[PDB]
Amino acid sequence: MKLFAQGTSLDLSHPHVMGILNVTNSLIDAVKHANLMINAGATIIDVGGESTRPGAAEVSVEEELQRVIPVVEAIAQRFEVWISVDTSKPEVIRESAKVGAHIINDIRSLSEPGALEAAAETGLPVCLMHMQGNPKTMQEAPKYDDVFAEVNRYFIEQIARCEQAGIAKEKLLLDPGFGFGKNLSHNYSLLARLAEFHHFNLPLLVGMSRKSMIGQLLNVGPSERLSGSLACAVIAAMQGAHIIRVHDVKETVEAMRVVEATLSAK
Numbered sequence: 001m002k003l004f005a006q007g008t009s010l011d012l013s014h015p016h017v018m019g020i021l022n023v024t025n026s027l028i029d030a031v032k033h034a035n036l037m038i039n040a041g042a043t044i045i046d047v048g049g050e051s052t053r054p055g056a057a058e059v060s061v062e063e064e065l066q067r068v069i070p071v072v073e074a075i076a077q078r079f080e081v082w083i084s085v086d087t088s089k090p091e092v093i094r095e096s097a098k099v100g101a102h103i104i105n106d107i108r109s110l111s112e113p114g115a116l117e118a119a120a121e122t123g124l125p126v127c128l129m130h131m132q133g134n135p136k137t138m139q140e141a142p143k144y145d146d147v148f149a150e151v152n153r154y155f156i157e158q159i160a161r162c163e164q165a166g167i168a169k170e171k172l173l174l175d176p177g178f179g180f181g182k183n184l185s186h187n188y189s190l191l192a193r194l195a196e197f198h199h200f201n202l203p204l205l206v207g208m209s210r211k212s213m214i215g216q217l218l219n220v221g222p223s224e225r226l227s228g229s230l231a232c233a234v235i236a237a238m239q240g241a242h243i244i245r246v247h248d249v250k251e252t253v254e255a256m257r258v259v260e261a262t263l264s265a266k
């Protein structure tokens with residue numbers, strides 16, 4: 001299983017660690033952080049200029065472009081690493097691809113006006129993530145009759161929507177969207193049944209690093225969640241998840257080697 005973008009490819013025969021690069025001189029530092037994550041073994045950098053917590057500011061198109069595009073460019077020029085852009089805005093999707101972005105990672109699965117068309121035109125890989133509602137309201141009272149079945153249904157419909165716009169199935173990644181309109185119970189149901197999403201024959205991407213599903217279980221703050229984050233990452237990668245989105249790259253990469261050695265022997 002492979003992905004293709006910007007003339008290169010990503011070989012998904014082993015788990016990949018995707019390092020988080022938040023962009024909120026800013027440019028000097030982002031590049032430094034990207035370099036460390038690459039030295040620690042990250043094969044993808046996820047660049048994002050808009051926060052997804054409920055009180056977060058709606059960032060304007062011009063503010064998001066100013067923060068994200070120079071970082072994406074500066075990485076594609078310096079390094080061989082793949083670049084994921086964490087945006088919902090067609091303009092950022094377009095401008096990101098023009099300066100070397102390899103993956104469109106949209107928490108809203110191209111629901112914004114023009115995002116679907118913009119993504120198709122780039123020809124890049126697209127991640128389709130599940131969220132109930134939207135970031136400012138999704139955690140109030142998340143509800144499912146059956147959370148696995150409903151996330152599954154959502155992937156069926158969104159793959160179809162992507163194909164209808166000329167985005168081939170082979171471009172797509174799927175992500176159950178841990179913490180995106182889900183309580184503690186919902187998150188763990190999804191993680192326990194993650195391997196069952198393989199029936200789509202598509203790369204699974206997961207993001208659980210330092211999240212509330214760990215925080216509520218250990219009753220600790222974000223800085224104290226590493227062990228819980230590694231446990232999540234290992235549980236996911238053992239079930240065949242292809243890309244793991246994390247803050248702590250060195251440690252996750254180390255844990256992924258142990259998983260890979262275990263999977264190779266199986």
Ligand SMILES: Cn1c(SCC(=O)Nc2ccccc2)nc2c(=O)[nH]c(N)nc21
Pocket residue numbers: 048052086105107127129175177178205206207208209210211212222245
């Ligand atoms: C951009 N993005 C995010 S941002 C939220 C976050 O990191 N929260 C958070 C960070 C630190 C502490 C607590 C919560 N989560 C995902 C995900 O799970 N999947 C994909 N594909 N993209 C994603």
